[PDB]
Every structure is written in C-alpha cells, then in structure tokens.
Design a protein around this ligand. Structure first.
Ligand SMILES: OC[C@H]1O[C@@H](O)[C@H](O)[C@@H](O)[C@@H]1O
Ligand SMILES: [Ca+2]
Ligand SMILES: [Ca+2]
Ligand SMILES: [Ca+2]
Length: 191
C-alpha cells in the first residue's frame, strides 16, 4: 500500500513538534510473534529531508546484545529512486537506531542519518531525519519500510513489528518495501 506524506520541517529533539499532531499515526500490523510491544509512527518531508517520528510502547528495554538488530531498536529502509530493485541498489538505504540513540547502518551512508531518542514510561520515542540527495517535489514516490526490533531481558530479539513486509526479507530485498508519495508543498509573516 501507499502512505501519503505531508510537507513540513520538524526539529529533531525527540520532542513532539506542534506540526506532528497535524498529521496521522501509522500502525505497523505485521508481528513475527505475539507480544505486549506496540508502535505507531508519523512522516513528513521538506526540500532537503525525510522526517520520521516513532513511538514504541515497550515495558522492558534491553541493548546488552552486541548485535545491533538484537537490541530494542527501529529500522528504516528507503528506495530513493524507487527502483523497486531485487537487491540493494546504489541509492538504497537501511539504518537502525536503538532506544539509547545508537545508530547503525546496513545499507547507505550513515552521515545522512540524524537521530534523537527520548525514554518514556514503558517505552521510548525516536525522531529521525534523513538527508535527501534527490530533489523532492510534490508527487514524488519512493520505497519505504519500517520495523521495530523487540528484545527481552535475556538480551536477544524475540519479536519484530513491520509496516509493509511480512516475509522478513526487507533487509535483503528493496522490492519488498511499500510506497510513500510526497504531497503538500506550496507553489509560492505579516506581523
Ligand atoms: O543484519 C541484517 C538483519 O536485518 C534485519 O532487517 C532483520 O530483521 C534480521 O533478520 C537481519 O539478520
Ligand atoms: Ca521536535
Ligand atoms: Ca523489550
Ligand atoms: Ca533504489
């Protein structure tokens, strides 16, 4: 399916910009197994960047596991040119940030990836910016997929939560991502 992204430039703090409450939550519904952990996320775009605000309900937080994806984290995947390739292309991006704000990259240049995270009672918040290389304009479509790695007190990932891909191959296969179409940028203060 296709998510529609409104135009806007939020401030990366791990605080909720006023302008975030004007767009909608997205619910990832693909669970690997049954779990307490739930999530919701919002999207925005501006002339330079893609913006993501995520909130995870998760009562037990762990990142003792030295495997990045085996920590309470979230992963974002991007197909910028919208190649819907079978394997990762030169413009394909795959990053991850744990609750502590520790960033790791599976695909693409991590210098593009700017993140802050806040602890909440029984969860955390992630606010990320991704520098765009292509000039985003209304109607632009890209590949996008979102995932929540849920670990337990054993320091191991027990469950995943996915927005688009239920197969578990998002980390291999760009074509498994979903759609984001950008809209809402102007064509054109009085004190
Ligand atoms: O390190 C690559 C990892 O990427 C993640 O997207 C997947 O959930 C893991 O199963 C995979 O091993
Ligand atoms: Ca903010
Ligand atoms: Ca957990
Ligand atoms: Ca691509």
């Amino acid at each position: 399916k296709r998510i529609y992204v409104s135009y806007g430039s939020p401030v990366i703090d791990g605080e909720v910009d006023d302008i975030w409450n004007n767009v909608e939550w997205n619910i990832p519904r693909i669970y690997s197994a049954t779990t307490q952990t739930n999530a919701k996320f919002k999207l925005m775009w501006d002339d330079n960047a893609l913006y993501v605000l995520a909130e995870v309900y998760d009562p037990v937080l762990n990142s003792a596991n030295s495997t990045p994806y085996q920590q309470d984290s979230v992963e974002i995947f991007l197909d910028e040119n919208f190649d819907r390739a079978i394997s990762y292309q030169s413009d394909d991006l795959h990053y991850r940030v744990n609750y502590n704000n520790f960033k790791t990259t599976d695909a693409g240049d991590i210098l593009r990836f700017y993140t802050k995270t806040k602890l909440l009672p029984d969860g955390y918040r992630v606010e990320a910016r991704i520098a765009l290389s292509k000039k985003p304009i209304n109607g632009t479509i890209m590949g996008f997929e979102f995932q929540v790695n849920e670990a337990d007190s054993s320091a191991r990932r027990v469950a995943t939560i996915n927005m688009f891909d239920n197969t578990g191959n998002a980390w291999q296969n760009p074509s498994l991502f979903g759609e984001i179409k950008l809209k809402g940028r102007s064509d054109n203060i009085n004190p």
